[PDB]
Structure 1
Amino acid sequence: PGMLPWPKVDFSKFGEIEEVELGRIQKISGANLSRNWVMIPHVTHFDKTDITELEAFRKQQNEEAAKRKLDVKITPVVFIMKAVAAALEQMPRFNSSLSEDGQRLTLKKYINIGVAVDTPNGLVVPVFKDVNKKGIIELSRELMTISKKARDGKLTAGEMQGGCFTISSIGGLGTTHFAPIVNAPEVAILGVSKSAMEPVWNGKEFVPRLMLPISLSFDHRVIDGADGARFITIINNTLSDIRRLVM
Structure 2
Amino acid sequence: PGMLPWPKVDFSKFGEIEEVELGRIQKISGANLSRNWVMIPHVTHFDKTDITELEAFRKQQNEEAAKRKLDVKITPVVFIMKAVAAALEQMPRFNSSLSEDGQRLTLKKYINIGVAVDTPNGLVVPVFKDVNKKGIIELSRELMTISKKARDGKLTAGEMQGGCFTISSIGGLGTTHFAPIVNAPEVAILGVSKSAMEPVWNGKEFVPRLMLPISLSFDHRVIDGADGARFITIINNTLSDIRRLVM
TM-score range, shorter chain: over 0.9
Counterpart residue number, 2:223: 223
Report whether the alignment pairs 1:207 with 2:207: yes
Q: Distance in 1 between matches of 2:189 and 2:157?
A: 21
1:223-242 alignment runs, 5 A limit = 223-242=223-242
Aligned-pair identity in percent equals 100
Task: Supply the distance in 2 between the matched residues of 1:204 and 1:30 (Cα, whole angstroms).
Answer: 51
Deviation at 1:157, TM superposition (A): 1.2
Structure 1 CA distance for aligned equivalents of residues 119 and 50 of structure 2 = 30
Task: Tell me by how many angstroms 1:87 deviates.
Answer: 0.2
The CA distance in 2 between the partners of 1:137 and 1:109, in whole Å, is 24
TM-superposed deviation, 1:60:
1.1
Which deviations, in whole Å up to 9, do the C-alpha atoms of 1:5-47 show, x marking residues without a partner? 1111101011110011100110000110110000001100000
2:98 & 2:5 partners in 1: Cα distance? 31
In structure 2, how many angstroms separate the alpha carbons of the residues matched to 1:115 and 1:64?
A: 26
Deviation at 1:148, TM superposition (A): 1.1
Judge conservation of contact 1:178–1:191 (CA < 8 Å) in 2: yes
Q: Does structure 2 conserve the Cα–Cα contact (< 8 Å) formed by 1:127 and 1:160? A: yes
Q: Is the 8 A contact 1:83 1:245 kept in 2?
A: no
The CA distance in 2 between the partners of 1:179 and 1:68, in whole Å, is 41
Measure, in 2, the Cα distance between the counterparts of 1:244 and 1:228. 22
Q: Is the 8 A contact 1:166 1:188 kept in 2?
A: yes
Unaligned runs of 5+ in 2: none
| Contact 1:127–1:162 (8 Å) recurs in 2 | yes
How far the C-alpha of 1:68 sits from its partner, in A, is 0.9
What's the counterpart of residue 170 of structure 2?
A: 170
Instruction: Tell me how far apart the structure 1 counterparts of residues 59 and 37 of structure 2 sit (CA, whole Å).
Output: 39
Deviation at 1:246, TM superposition (A): 4.9
Provide the aligned length of Structure 1 versus Structure 2.
247
Q: Is the 8 Å Cα contact of residues 182 and 219 (structure 1) preserved in structure 2?
A: yes
1:67-106 equivalent positions in 2, closer than 5 A: 67-106=67-106
Superimposed CA distance per residue, residues 203-234 of structure 1 (whole angstroms, 9 cap, x where no aligned partner): 11110110000000000001000000000000
CA-to-partner distance for each residue in 1:171-216, whole Å, 9 max, x for gaps? 1101001000001100000000000001111111110110000000
* Structure 1, gaps ≥5 residues long: none
Query: Could you tell me how far apart the structure 1 residues matched to 2:120 and 2:54 are?
Result: 30
Q: CA RMSD in A?
A: 0.9
TM-score by length of 2: 0.98
Checking the alignment, whether the CA contact within 8 Å between 1:86 and 1:245 is kept in structure 2 is no
Contact 1:72–1:137, Cα closer than 8 Å, also in 2: yes
Please give the secondary structure, in 2, of the residue aligned with 1:26. helix
Q: In 2, are the aligned partners of 1:87 and 1:234 still within 8 Å (CA)?
A: yes
Q: Is the 8 A contact 1:182 1:217 kept in 2?
A: yes
In structure 2, the residue matched to 1:128 is 128
CA distance in 1, matches of 2:196, 2:229: 22
- Shift of residue 244, structure 1, vs aligned partner: 3.7
State the 1:242 CA deviation. Answer: 1.6
Report runs of 4+ in structure 1 exceeding 3 Å deviation.
244-247
Asked if the contact 1:82/1:131 (under 8 Å) is kept, the reply is yes
Checking the alignment, whether the CA contact within 8 Å between 1:181 and 1:217 is kept in structure 2 is: yes
Question: Per-residue displacement from partner, 1:97-143 (whole Å, max 9, x unpaired)?
Answer: 00011110000000000000000010110000000000100000011
